[PDB]
Amino acid sequence: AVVEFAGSAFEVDEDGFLNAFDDWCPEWVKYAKGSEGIGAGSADHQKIIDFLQDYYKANGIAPMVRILSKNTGFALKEIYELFPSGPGKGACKMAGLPKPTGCV
Amino acid sequence: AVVEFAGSAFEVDEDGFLNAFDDWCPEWVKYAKGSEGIGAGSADHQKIIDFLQDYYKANGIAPMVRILSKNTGFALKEIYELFPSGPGKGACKMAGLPKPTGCV
Amino acid sequence: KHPTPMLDELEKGPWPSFVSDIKQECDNRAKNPKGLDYQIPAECPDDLLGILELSFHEGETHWKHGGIVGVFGYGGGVIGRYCDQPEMFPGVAHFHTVRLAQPAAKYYTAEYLEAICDVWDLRGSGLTNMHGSTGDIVLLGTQTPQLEEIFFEMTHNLNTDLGGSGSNLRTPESCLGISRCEFACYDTQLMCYQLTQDYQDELHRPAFPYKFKFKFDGCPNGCVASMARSDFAVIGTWKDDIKIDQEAVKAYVGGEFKPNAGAHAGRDWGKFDIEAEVVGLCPTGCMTYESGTLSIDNKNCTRCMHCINTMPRALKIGDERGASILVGAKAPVLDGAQMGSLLIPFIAAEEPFDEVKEVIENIWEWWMEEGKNRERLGETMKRVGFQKLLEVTGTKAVPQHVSEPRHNPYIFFKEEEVPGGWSRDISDYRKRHMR
Amino acid sequence: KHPTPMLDELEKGPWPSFVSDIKQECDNRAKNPKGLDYQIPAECPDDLLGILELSFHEGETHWKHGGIVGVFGYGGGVIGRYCDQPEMFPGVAHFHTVRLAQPAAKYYTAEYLEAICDVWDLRGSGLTNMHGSTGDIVLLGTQTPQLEEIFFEMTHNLNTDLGGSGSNLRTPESCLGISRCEFACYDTQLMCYQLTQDYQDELHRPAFPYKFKFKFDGCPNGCVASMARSDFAVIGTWKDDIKIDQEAVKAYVGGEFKPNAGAHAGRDWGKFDIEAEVVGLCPTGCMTYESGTLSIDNKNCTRCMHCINTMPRALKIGDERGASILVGAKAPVLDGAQMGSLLIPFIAAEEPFDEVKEVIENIWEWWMEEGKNRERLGETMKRVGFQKLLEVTGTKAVPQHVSEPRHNPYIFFKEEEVPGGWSRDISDYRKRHMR
Amino acid sequence: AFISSGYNPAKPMENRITDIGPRKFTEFFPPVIAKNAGNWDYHEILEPGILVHVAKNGDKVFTVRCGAARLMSTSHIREACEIAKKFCNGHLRFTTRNNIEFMVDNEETLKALVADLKTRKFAAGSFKFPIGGTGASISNIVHTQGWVYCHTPATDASGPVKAVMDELFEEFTSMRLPAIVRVSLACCINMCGAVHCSDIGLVGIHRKPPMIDHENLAELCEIPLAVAACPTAAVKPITAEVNGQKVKSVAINNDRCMYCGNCYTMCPALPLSDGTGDGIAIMVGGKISNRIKVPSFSKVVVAFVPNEPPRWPTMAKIVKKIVEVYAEDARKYERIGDWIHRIGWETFYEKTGLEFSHHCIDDFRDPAYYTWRQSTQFKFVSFDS
Amino acid sequence: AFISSGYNPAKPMENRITDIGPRKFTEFFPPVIAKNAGNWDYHEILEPGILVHVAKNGDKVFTVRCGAARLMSTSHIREACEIAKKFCNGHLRFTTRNNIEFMVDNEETLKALVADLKTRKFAAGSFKFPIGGTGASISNIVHTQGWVYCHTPATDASGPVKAVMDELFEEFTSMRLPAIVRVSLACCINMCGAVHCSDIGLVGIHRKPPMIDHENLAELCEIPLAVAACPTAAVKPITAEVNGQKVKSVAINNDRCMYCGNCYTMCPALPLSDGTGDGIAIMVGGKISNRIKVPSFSKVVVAFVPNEPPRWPTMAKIVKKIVEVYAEDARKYERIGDWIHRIGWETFYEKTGLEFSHHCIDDFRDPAYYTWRQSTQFKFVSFDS
Numbered sequence A, B: 001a002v003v004e005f006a007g008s009a010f011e012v013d014e015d016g017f018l019n020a021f022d023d024w025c026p027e028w029v030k031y032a033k034g035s036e037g038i039g040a041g042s043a044d045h046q047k048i049i050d051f052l053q054d055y056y057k058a059n060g061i062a063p064m065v066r067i068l069s070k071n072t073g074f075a076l077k078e079i080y081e082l083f084p085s086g087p088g089k090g091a092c093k094m095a096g097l098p099k100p101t102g103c104v
Numbered sequence C, D: 001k002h003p004t005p006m007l008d009e010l011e012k013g014p015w016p017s018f019v020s021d022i023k024q025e026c027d028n029r030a031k032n033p034k035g036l037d038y039q040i041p042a043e044c045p046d047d048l049l050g051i052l053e054l055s056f057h058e059g060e061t062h063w064k065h066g067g068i069v070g071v072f073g074y075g076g077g078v079i080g081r082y083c084d085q086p087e088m089f090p091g092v093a094h095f096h097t098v099r100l101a102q103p104a105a106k107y108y109t110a111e112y113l114e115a116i117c118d119v120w121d122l123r124g125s126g127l128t129n130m131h132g133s134t135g136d137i138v139l140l141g142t143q144t145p146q147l148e149e150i151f152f153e154m155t156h157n158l159n160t161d162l163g164g165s166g167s168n169l170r171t172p173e174s175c176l177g178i179s180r181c182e183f184a185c186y187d188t189q190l191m192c193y194q195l196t197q198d199y200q201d202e203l204h205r206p207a208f209p210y211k212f213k214f215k216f217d218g219c220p221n222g223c224v225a226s227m228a229r230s231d232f233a234v235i236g237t238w239k240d241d242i243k244i245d246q247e248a249v250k251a252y253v254g255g256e257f258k259p260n261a262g263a264h265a266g267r268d269w270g271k272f273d274i275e276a277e278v279v280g281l282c283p284t285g286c287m288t289y290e291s292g293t294l295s296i297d298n299k300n301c302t303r304c305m306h307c308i309n310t311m312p313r314a315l316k317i318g319d320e321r322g323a324s325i326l327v328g329a330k331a332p333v334l335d336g337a338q339m340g341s342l343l344i345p346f347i348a349a350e351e352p353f354d355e356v357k358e359v360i361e362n363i364w365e366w367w368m369e370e371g372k373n374r375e376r377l378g379e380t381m382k383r384v385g386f387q388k389l390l391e392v393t394g395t396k397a398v399p400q401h402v403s404e405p406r407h408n409p410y411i412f413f414k415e416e417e418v419p420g421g422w423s424r425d426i427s428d429y430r431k432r433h434m435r
Numbered sequence E, F: 001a002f003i004s005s006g007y008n009p010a011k012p013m014e015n016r017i018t019d020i021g022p023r024k025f026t027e028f029f030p031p032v033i034a035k036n037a038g039n040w041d042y043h044e045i046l047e048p049g050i051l052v053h054v055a056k057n058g059d060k061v062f063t064v065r066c067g068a069a070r071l072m073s074t075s076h077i078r079e080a081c082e083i084a085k086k087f088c089n090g091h092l093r094f095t096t097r098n099n100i101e102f103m104v105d106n107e108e109t110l111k112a113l114v115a116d117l118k119t120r121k122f123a124a125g126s127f128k129f130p131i132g133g134t135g136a137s138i139s140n141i142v143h144t145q146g147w148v149y150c151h152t153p154a155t156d157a158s159g160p161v162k163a164v165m166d167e168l169f170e171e172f173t174s175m176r177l178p179a180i181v182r183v184s185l186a187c188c189i190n191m192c193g194a195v196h197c198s199d200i201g202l203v204g205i206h207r208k209p210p211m212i213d214h215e216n217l218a219e220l221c222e223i224p225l226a227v228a229a230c231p232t233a234a235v236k237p238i239t240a241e242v243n244g245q246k247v248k249s250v251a252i253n254n255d256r257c258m259y260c261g262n263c264y265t266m267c268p269a270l271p272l273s274d275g276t277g278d279g280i281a282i283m284v285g286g287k288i289s290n291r292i293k294v295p296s297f298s299k300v301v302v303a304f305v306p307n308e309p310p311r312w313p314t315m316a317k318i319v320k321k322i323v324e325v326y327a328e329d330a331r332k333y334e335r336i337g338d339w340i341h342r343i344g345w346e347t348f349y350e351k352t353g354l355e356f357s358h359h360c361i362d363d364f365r366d367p368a369y370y371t372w373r374q375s376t377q378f379k380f381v382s383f384d385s
């Protein structure tokens, strides 16, 4: 499907992840916000999103949870406070990274 | 010891192999001739010497006997007719490569 | 209802047919006796058979790759799935599975299961698995919007959580243990329950390099197959003498008591020959029968359970009980299948199980930091080495840790163990050894 | 030189002392009874004691790395060596080893060995190894200039060639076979001799990716250990029935004939018990002893040799003989030790041995082209696969080829074996299976 | 149409309960079990599918084990419940092999329960609660999702399992084998469940390399993971050009690929399922218990049989053949693996009539060497003729 | 003087004879052997070191086996020849374990030969031709070069062999063991000879990474060969400096290095021998015959014992203890490996009193897993206390 928001269009799949990382933009985050239980984006939310994007651009993969926490300084518990759906379904989705894979 | 021949000096070990490949010179071949049972150097001789030299510079190791024969087109029998001591003790020594190692 | 020629063939035969059962549920939702307002298409089950029938024809699955769905607060418990012919089978377009935490050894009361069914019939397909291979009650098929609803009902009304999925601790499971077995060396169900409750955060939220499972067996016979299907297996045993009742032994030799409690009854094997069926089958040959008197050299008994399994009424487990911890089991991918390897030969197993929890946490602390992405504990063990595992768990290496010692000589030593260390000057060596 | 407190300790004790022997040769050369004009220093052995004594004090070898010497026409046969303290021990400045080709199973005449000793006393140290582990007679220690002189004498006056060394075929050796053993299934010495002669060129001139060894055992007992120390092991066996002489069996049972030909006479193991020492030890349990008669269910006999070894007067090998071919044995370096893996269960083993030779040449054709630099056949088998080895030798896969079938499902198939091949269009698939 | 639970999607985190885990088992215990747990004296198998446990104080609990399809409707579950409310005071349980056990405290109730169970069948004819699975028999088959729910299967689960249990039904309702025979199935090499440690294991396998959707791959996939997912390093990152467009992708060396499908598990753009290519591999000789002999992995004896919906005749016949030969030739207490270890592999093949192929010879890494035969010990069989 | 053989260094290829191989064994056979080869009926071990083979036609050949040091002088060889000419018509042979065998055709000559052999001793005391090595005994030790000739040893060969045979001499001259006990030694991990398949194996090992001679390495070494020579991939190519200048060399990651020395075998600029660091690893349980049980590799039971010239007491003592415990506990026909497979490793260590260390647990590649214990089967031993 194709999402229309703030004059922007984002192609997405059945789970709401962007079809193409390059179509990411700030409007996407404002769009996804509520779906992922976030009322207002904070400086911390953006620091997570920023990290995830730089890591993906550099490594071609999403960072392991231990790296995400160790780098941002946010423990897993804090990461869930920021993103209720978790680092995968919430943070990665909002950051524009592709849908997690493997067994589960 | 240092071989003194034709105004040139070549550092060698007890078995007559050049200590440094970079010290190789055409006179080296003329020096080692008789010791390797070779009275006259033919084009076929140089062809082998040239291949060993290029292979060594490019790969950092002496070529496998199979490769030596395949490229030069000389079977092992011919190789020995050219270098009575064999591709190792004979050709490699004459080509300036380092002494062969391992279990014999 | 679709035509289902091939599935119909599976309604034939004596074994309970899943097709006949699914069809019965289709009929039920069609009549809707209860007048539910089905939150997903009443014809959901009708479509699963329709798409299953298509798969029989074509020889290929009709589910799209993957899916990422869940409930807030958790990073798993729900396996998302979408059919790849949503126009043909609208009722399985979304067909998610919800993994529900089950009671240890799966003991239930009708009231409880019926309550779960009431919620499911409403919000899902009507279809289940009883039970998933890890252990969970599997609720097979629903739509995304129902998830939060289900989860809310399950917690507020049924005081039941989701099971686990993903790169985390999965649902633990135990054999029935002391509930119904005279071989149980510890309360497997209690340990299973206690550790499931203790480690909830680790089960609901992915913090690990990969998946991790706990399984608890009451004795070596392996009724929950811990040593095969869990990364950390706790298997009961004893350290004192097997209890022998000579008179019962006589009851066996005589025919009054049936061998293996009657397990081979369906066939005529001859009369019981204690020598041929017990003493002569003992792996260590530590048993003896002389003058109508059975005895056991326990020092040389490996507690394989054979004699006990064969003469349950005459031979009992010891009284000094505990368990063994075997780790690393996993299926083939990537690097090959593994069964659990013995780590702690004997450890206490009494509530609140601290010794065992200590081992679990020491392993996690190490593996969490050292394990590579998507690398199972067993594979980390192969890469880094069994000796590292010992070190991090504070376990002394013993002969019991091997089935055989190494036959290569590529032995690693710690610098500190070597006099002089590893810093050497080749200059001094050359003093003794001319180039 | 020359005082040797540590080595002197090794002159004590019952076992023949190599030090006392080396000292005897030192004394013989110093005295020079035959007035020989030693072509290397008479004190050579003396300096060998001295440098050895120094190694004993320092716990470190005193030989320089490697050495490349030899005779014209060959690429191997001599292992050059130079001591690392030339000034201290001039007698062993050069201390080359010459490997001499030995007669199969090492049968000798005094005239021949004396002839060899005459050449070595004059041109060598007077020290030898009888024999090196591969089989060669080893002339231990000489100088470079003597290599061609020794070779000239050996070939022209003793009709004896050098053995092998380097990346080629090494000196083949066999058990004594039919020369003095009633268990021999084929003429191991003859096969050894003929093949050594047939492949002289492969032995003297390195044309292989690495070293390669042949070893011939007359039966599974492995007296030359071909299965552990050769890349190509030929081990004799039979295809028909073991021969049983009941009169001889009764002689064993009665004590007239001693079990294992008296190999356990130094201890009281009690009277021979055929049931406990033979029937009960057979690995397949294919033997029967009833009413005083011994029988063997040959179909289930793996011909392990135990019963024959234990009652050699009563039980004989069959008359339909041949051999098995096992390949790939090697020491650990690099990828781990290997023993021979069964390739050809049964093959003809009679002169001119065309059958065995065909297998050898087929393996070389493949390995000489596919083996990597310094890769033993056994390692090529590991890298490329056993199946490849079967192909190249035209051998049909049989259950006998495995000790156990694989337990991983990573099965490769040939494209031509799969209907439709491997060319598939994703667009067509995607018409059945939407993204 | 929407009926809420009380959940407020506008305030998702309010009132959320987490980490309560499962209900405690003890809640669910029938009285006799709760009272005598840990004090059992002995047990006895009375008949096929019927056990009794006797406590040290004398109390007894009778158990009736029944077969189940694992995949079941709420109506069926319901039915199990009804039975429990009628004869077991509402109590029941499920086994590690997905059988349903019903428990009562007296023989009279036991006889009434059994008689009833025997009368329950679907309209089509199959038994709803067949009694058995105890002792030396063939209990339920441990199995997976198959085409009912998974995206990576190479075969189905429920279908095959039914087909096989029908053929082995007599082995479930009787105790006439030398020892228990565990049969398990997995629809793909990930091997969920028990196939790798069962007496007879069935594994879905592929025979064709995956198709690569070059056009969308980088978009859909984290390339490094697909590369790392390959056990044989057949996947490599590349810069592809599709319809004149430059995109990152991967290349697969079909020569190194053995169709495990792990790359597909990690990347939706490498699908590999195929109707004629896919099938089942048959394994034998594994076990999990430590009784007499140590546990062992099942071994591949038949590399490939084809998928033949709906009753997989070829595969089913082979399974029945193996069970038949084993039951006849194995000694008391010998598991299939124990039996094979005793007679040897060439004899196993001679006796079963199974075709041995080179595909069964291990070729995966260093450990494959240990599976070859390093001994002269072998028996002459039809193979060598 | 220069005493020429006839060879001409000016025309080396003149008169050159090549590819003639060894002499044929038939030329050196005793007549009794030549005549009856292939027609042997049976054999009997008359006493320690003395055998008799009887041909079908009644002919007999008696064999006397004598221990020998392998490393020997021409004088010793000549003495063996003197004996052969005196009693054996000039014939003798050597065994695959380097013992000497004298053969005669009658009992009178056999008695004379035996009486003769016993009188031959070196001045310093040792027997020159000790009779034995037959049946269930310890017959010589297959060994290597050691410090007598090799550049890659981690220990000596001849010295330790003399030390061990002295302490086990009573086992060479008698047949009191449960089965043959083969002892072998190798001075480095190349394991020339028979270590990896012996009942008791001794291997020289290092405990320190090699030293790197940067100034000459590039000149003297084929870098890639050194890199590919490492089993644990601990070697890699790097830029180093010599006299403030850049050069090509190698770097060794000490944490991946297990001191095998294979890189030194391929490169003279990476020496690693060390007086205090080097020692011996003790292995047990291997065999090559196929009698009853299949062949097997020896396993490391004591990771390290120091080198202690000239008699290696620590090592000698351990070898003696293993033989004593084995001879006392094993059953008839049981090889050391067979015995251990029966009693178990934990019992082996308990009975021998040997200290088990983590160093004996395999950690080399994937096959290592198989060496661990995948079973609950174990016996309680002092280890666990």
Ligand code: SRM
Pocket (backbone or CB within 6 Å): B102, B103, B104, D066, D079, D081, D097, D099, D129, D131, D132, D133, D134, D135, D136, D137, D163, D164, D171, D213, D228, D229, D230, D329, D330, D331, D332, D333, D334, D376, F143, F144, F145, F149, F150, F151, F152, F190, F191, F192, F193, F194, F265
């Ligand atoms: C002399 C001898 C030992 C002895 O005292 O008996 C010997 C001596 C050497 N062997 Fe060997 N090997 C000897 C039998 C063996 C055997 C046993 C056999 O052949 O029956 C083996 C095990 C079987 C095998 O082939 O693996 C053996 C496996 C090795 C290896 C390990 C090869 C491997 O693939 O793992 C090496 C190291 C290498 O090749 O890189 C080696 C290396 C060496 C070298 C050439 C070391 C070197 O780099 O120069 C040794 C020379 C010592 C010297 O100074 O003379 N030697 N070597 C034996 C050969 C003499 C002969 O002409 O009769």
Ligand code: SRM
Pocket (backbone or CB within 6 Å): A102, A103, A104, C066, C079, C081, C097, C099, C131, C132, C133, C134, C135, C136, C137, C138, C163, C164, C171, C213, C228, C229, C230, C329, C330, C331, C332, C333, C334, C376, E143, E144, E145, E149, E150, E151, E152, E190, E191, E192, E193, E194, E265
């Ligand atoms: C539902 C269940 C099969 C069943 O029908 O019973 C199952 C289903 C799946 N398993 Fe599992 N596994 C199930 C028990 C197991 C077991 C057995 C056990 O836990 O007792 C194993 C073997 C033990 C182990 O952990 O290795 C198992 C080993 C795997 C593997 C192989 C992992 C490995 O390290 O080798 C995978 C593949 C992977 O993780 O990459 C996998 C992958 C999968 C996935 C998640 C495939 C995917 O990529 O999404 C399957 C989802 C199917 C679906 O659509 O629902 N599943 N899986 C079982 C779990 C349900 C439940 O919560 O109680």
Ligand code: SF4
Pocket (backbone or CB within 6 Å): C175, C176, C177, C178, C180, C181, C182, C183, C184, C185, C217, C218, C219, C220, C221, C222, C223, C224
């Ligand atoms: S594993 Fe041992 S304790 Fe648990 S149900 Fe099975 S027999 Fe009983």
Ligand code: SF4
Pocket (backbone or CB within 6 Å): C281, C282, C283, C284, C285, C286, C287, C296, C300, C301, C302, C303, C304, C305, C306, C307, C308, E292
């Ligand atoms: S449990 Fe197993 S090891 Fe111990 S006595 Fe009984 S049969 Fe022997």
Ligand code: SF4
Pocket (backbone or CB within 6 Å): D175, D176, D177, D178, D181, D182, D183, D184, D185, D217, D218, D219, D220, D221, D222, D223, D224
């Ligand atoms: S390998 Fe067999 S034929 Fe050869 S000498 Fe030894 S027991 Fe006799």
Ligand code: SF4
Pocket (backbone or CB within 6 Å): D281, D282, D283, D284, D285, D286, D287, D296, D300, D301, D302, D303, D304, D305, D306, D307, D308, F292
């Ligand atoms: S040779 Fe070995 S397998 Fe054949 S009958 Fe004798 S003991 Fe049993």
Ligand code: SF4
Pocket (backbone or CB within 6 Å): E144, E145, E146, E150, E151, E152, E153, E154, E186, E187, E188, E189, E190, E191, E192
């Ligand atoms: S075995 Fe493979 S195909 Fe079947 S459920 Fe598990 S992952 Fe899905």
Ligand code: SF4
Pocket (backbone or CB within 6 Å): E209, E210, E229, E230, E231, E232, E233, E234, E235, E252, E256, E257, E258, E259, E260, E261, E262, E263, E264
């Ligand atoms: S299917 Fe398996 S073997 Fe083939 S490329 Fe994918 S991961 Fe590698």
Ligand code: SF4
Pocket (backbone or CB within 6 Å): F144, F145, F146, F150, F151, F152, F153, F154, F186, F187, F188, F189, F190, F191, F192
């Ligand atoms: S074992 Fe090592 S050190 Fe001893 S002779 Fe063979 S190569 Fe040299």
Ligand code: SF4
Pocket (backbone or CB within 6 Å): F209, F210, F229, F230, F231, F232, F233, F234, F235, F252, F256, F257, F258, F259, F260, F261, F262, F263, F264
């Ligand atoms: S000694 Fe062996 S482990 Fe250490 S770097 Fe050299 S070759 Fe690799």
Ligand SMILES: O=S([O-])[O-]
Pocket (backbone or CB within 6 Å): A103, C134, C166, C170, C211
């Ligand atoms: O579902 S699997 O990951 O156990």
Ligand SMILES: O=S([O-])[O-]
Pocket (backbone or CB within 6 Å): B103, B104, D134, D165, D170, D211, F192
């Ligand atoms: O000489 S060794 O390589 O056999």
